[PDB]
Structure 1
């Protein structure tokens, strides 16, 4: 029961050299799948991982025919059978966060397992998050810090009380709990996570691309100040 359905994806030309990240383009949809490929180490990212992740996402950003990015983690671990989206630290990861934030495409994080530390922050900055009911685990390790989108932005999803709780105590939360607080859009059966992700991607791609771009930047504008204004006005310039 692996979330990954190989038949639905094709490798993107120009990335045979990837080792820490897998990059696929859907066989029919204007959707790509970017995933951490280090299950043995719970998909923790090392400097090299960040470089590939940035390269891949930047390429997706510039792909005219791609309207949705599915960001997830491959699994399970061959070592213990566990599941992880991204366990965090082992080009800065902050640049990856901004790339996700600023790209004119909807980025959906598919939390298939542990999402801790920097991995948790990556999920927070994504536009939407779908999570495995059985294996998704949310834990902000930091304080055990990310004073940017990792934290402050979480408050714009679950509220100041819950956000402070998540960070100050660093407890572990399930997909359902995070859904109740407002940080997870929907909970899905583990085996169905990616299938549900592709359904959401399809509904998004079925609408006006220009409208989707404008909307994303309109939502960003609320908290990104001048940068947010630049991107929205930039798209207004057509």
Structure 2
């Protein structure tokens, strides 16, 4: 059922200048100052390959420089045409770290909409976003890192502790278990759980409430929150805004 898909086609318009995208879709809301950036490889659980990261960075960088956009919804398209499964981003198949810093530093609120599996790099992308809304039925959080020799020792991990605390964060990474939206909400990494079909609708509601406030204030607030854990980099961004005033 197309009506059961999180994507509300009539609410979006393709952003001009990105017809060449193959691994990522990029839309601009018809009314609100909100864009939709999504992984477009459902056939492979929205895993990202070097080319996917290139497009992801280019898209987010453009949203960052769009004066009329105050909120970015980051999600994954689906379901998989191959097995009907759902995925936000299952991780690896420039670098993905650069994408994380882009989300972290852009003066806009980035809301991650976990519509399905969020594993490995995909999970870390969710953690670094400012807010997260997850599908009650299909969101699945699993930190894949420890199993393979790799691991995300920065925002991916350390920053997770700043959301769910040291005990839970260590648990999530050390055992690599799979968690639902509700469990992750209880721990503090998911702001709210929503019905799958409503995931983006709720996301749009959240973005509308955010855009209704002072853009300047929202910008200052984000860097005030970052300033904490980002040391001199955080101070530079916040101070940079101060000087702008």
Question: Shorter-chain TM-score: which interval?
Answer: over 0.9
- Secondary structure of the 1:159 match is helix
Deviation at 1:158, TM superposition (A): 0.1
Deviation at 1:81, TM superposition (A): 0.2
Tell me the TM-score normalised to structure 2 length. 0.97
- Deviations along 1:21-76, whole A, 9 cap, x unmatched? 00000000000000000000000000000000000000000000000000000000
1:138 match: secondary structure: strand
Within the candidate set 9, 14, 39, 1:11 is matched to 14
- Match for residue 53 of structure 1 among 52, 56, 72: 56
Q: Which runs of 5+ in 1 are unaligned?
A: none
Deviation at 1:155, TM superposition (A): 0.2
Displacement, 1:95? 0.0
- Following TM superposition, the consecutive aligned residue runs of length 4 or more in structure 1 with deviations greater than 6 angstroms are none
How far apart in 2 are the matches of 1:51 and 1:143? 26
Shift of 1:214: 0.1
Give me the whole-angstrom Cα distance separating, in 2, the residues matched to 1:24 and 1:38: 16
Q: Give the distance between the partners of 2:94 and 2:130, measured in 1 at CA.
A: 22
Corresponding residue SS for 2:48: coil
TM superposition shift of 1:232: 0.1
CA deviations over 1:108-141 (Å, ceiling 9, x no partner): 0000000000000000000000000000000000
Q: Deviations over 1:193-232 (max 9, x none)?
A: 0000000000000000000000000000010000000000
Shift of residue 15 of structure 1?
A: 0.1
Equivalent residues, number: 238
CA deviation profile, 1:74-115 (whole Å, cap 9, x unmatched): 000000000000000001000000000000000000000000
Q: 2:170 aligned with 1:164, yes or no?
A: yes
Cα displacement (A) at 1:3: 0.2
TM-score, normalised on structure 1? Answer: 1.00
CA distance in structure 2 between the partners assigned to 1:185 and 1:5 by the alignment: 22
CA distance in 2, matches of 1:49, 1:237: 36
Q: CA offsets, 1:137-157, max 9 Å, x none?
A: 000001110000000000000
Instruction: Quote how far apart the aligned CAs of 1:189 are.
Output: 0.1
**Alignment partners' CA distance in 2, 1:187 and 1:61:** 27
> Which whole-Å CA distance do the structure 1 matches of 2:36 and 2:242 have between them?
29
Equivalent-residue separation in structure 1 for 2:173 and 2:164 (angstroms): 12
User: 1:30 is matched with which residue: 33, 37, 62?
Assistant: 33
Inter-partner Cα distance in structure 2 for 1:147 and 1:89: 16
Aligned residue for 1:143, secondary structure, equals: helix
| Alignment RMSD | 0.2
In 2, Cα distance between the equivalents of 1:186 and 1:237? 35
Q: Secondary structure at the match of 2:88?
A: strand
